[PDB]
Structure formats: C-alpha cells, structure tokens
Amino acid sequence: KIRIRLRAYDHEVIDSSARKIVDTVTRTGAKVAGPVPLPTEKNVFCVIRSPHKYKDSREHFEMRTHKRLIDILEPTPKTVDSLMRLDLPAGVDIEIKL
C-alpha cells in the first residue's frame, strides 16, 4: 500500500532522503516496509577525446540513476499530508503512487 519511488544520482542523498521519509512516517505511526534498493540505471557515453582526427583515445562517462522503494503499509491520512508537504533535496525526486 502507498508506493514511494525515490530516484537520484547520488546514493548518499538517496539514502538520506529515504531515512527522512521512513522516520517521518514512523513519527506519524504508520509502520512502513524498509527502503529496498532497485537496480541502478547505468548509461554509458563514449566520446572522442580530441576535437579532431584522434579516434583511438576516448573518454567514457556514466549517468548512474539510483532508485529506492518505500511501502507505506499504514494508510494514515496524517502521514499522507506529511509526505505531500515535506521538503526534499533538489537532486532527488519523489513519486507517490496512492
């Protein structure tokens, strides 16, 4: 019941946000499933290092998306208001499935 999907690029801020969510809902009772980590999206970009005629030397980059999942077993409309009104860091987004 009540899904919370957290996505960001830094696992430190992911973990901090998940801890804040779970400690908030708990402060409002509502027992909630622990933050379960989904597989991290791993996009890879290869780029010719030089601006011209040098293809054998290249640079690789990744955009790792870290995802965590929270279940709010207890309905608790007070926790509903809390989870819609609290503030989260800009780097992480929130997805609430009612």
């Binding site: 996505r7 960001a8 690029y9 998306t65 860091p89 800009a90 780097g91 992480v92 987004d93």
Partner: protein, 206 residues
C-alpha cells in the same frame, strides 16, 4: 596537452556537481537553459568576478547560487541590480528564479578568482612574471599548501607563443584525495588572448 581537468578527475570522488536536479524527459532542455543562464551571467557579470554558478531545480522553479568575490556589483544599490538580473533571468528562461549571491572567504585562495585577477592584469598590460609572482605570494600568505600558475600565449605582446609557469609548495595532481581547486581564464589583449591556468592545493580531504 595531455593533462586531465582536475575537477572532472575528482568529480564524484571529492568534489561535487555544480547542478543538482533530476529530470528524464526535459533533461536536454534543462541543460540548454542552464547553459543560457551560465553564459548570460558570465557575459554580464565579469566585473563582480564569478567563482561558480550553482543551479538547483525543484519543480519549474530554478535556484541560482552565485559565488562572487565582490557581490557589490551584483547587488547594486539596495538590491536594484539583483532585482534587474533576476528579472532578466525570468525573461531568459520563463521560470521562477530564486537568486542568492554568496561570498568567497578567501578570494586569494580560490583558483578561479586568481585566474580572473591574473588575466585582468595581463589585459591591463602588467608584466606577467610580476603578476604571477604576486598571485603566488598572496596565495601562500593566505595559506594554500601549493600554488601553480601557467600563462600561455603571446606573453608580452611577442610573436612566438610561450608557456611561462610558476609553482612552489606541493600540487599532487595525481592524488584523488588531494583537494585541488582549478581555475582558468583568458586575458583578452590587443594580441589575441592569453590562457591562464591556476591549480591550488587547498589540502587533503577524505
């Protein structure tokens, strides 16, 4: 010619990204507006001296941290210049901009402002050796553990290009735990432009 950018090398390890937002269907357009914001701010606020522009987004609302040595230019008189630059920012982007301007505690220790000053002196036609020595001495008076400055180009208005450099202390570029601040600027002279690069070893971090 073959050296990596220190900031990119230490990105994620010790230093952090200048932009903090998440978006997976608009990523390109947010990148474009960020580029527009940064170009506009750099082109219209040279006088203040920009260490960094840090961009955050929550929901169609953008937040700009402007790390400047002298925010007097940015704030103008009683925030008039701050209001006008914010208004130009809404005009440029179309979103709600919350702009805040922060000091740099040690401008003589921040590499980007050091490159700013060295390039300004070179443009004002100060002897490059004297400028580099002054910047180096000021950095070590502040208390940096290592300075390295390199000016490349038609130094002194000459014809051939040189790559004159100064350094003392320790600047371990190869060490990832080493906190190395990197700055770069271009002195626009009557003879092309001079590239000034500055590495400053702040210390060691975990």
């Amino acid at each position: 010619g073959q050296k990596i950018n220190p900031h990119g090398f230490r990105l994620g390890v010790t230093t952090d990204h200048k932009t903090r937002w998440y978006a997976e269907k608009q990523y390109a357009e947010l990148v474009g507006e960020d580029v527009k914001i940064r170009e506009w701010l750099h082109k219209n606020l040279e006088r203040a001296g920009l260490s960094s522009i840090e961009i955050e987004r929550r929901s169609e609302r953008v937040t700009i941290f402007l790390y400047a040595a002298r925010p007097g230019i940015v704030i103008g008189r009683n925030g008039a210049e701050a209001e006008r630059v914010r208004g130009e920012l809404e005009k440029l982007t179309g979103k709600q901009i919350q702009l805040n301007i922060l000091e740099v505690k040690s401008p003589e220790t921040d590499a980007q402002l050091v490159a700013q000053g060295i390039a300004e002196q070179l443009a004002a036609r100060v002897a490059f050796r004297r400028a580099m020595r002054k910047a180096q001495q000021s950095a070590m008076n502040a208390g940096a553990l290592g300075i390295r400055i390199k000016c490349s180009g038609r130094l002194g208005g000459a014809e051939m290009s040189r790559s004159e450099g100064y350094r003392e202390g320790r600047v371990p570029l190869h060490t990832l735990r080493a906190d190395i601040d990197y700055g770069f600027f271009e002195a626009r002279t009557t003879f092309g432009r001079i590239g000034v690069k500055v590495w400053i070893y702040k210390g060691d971090v975990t």
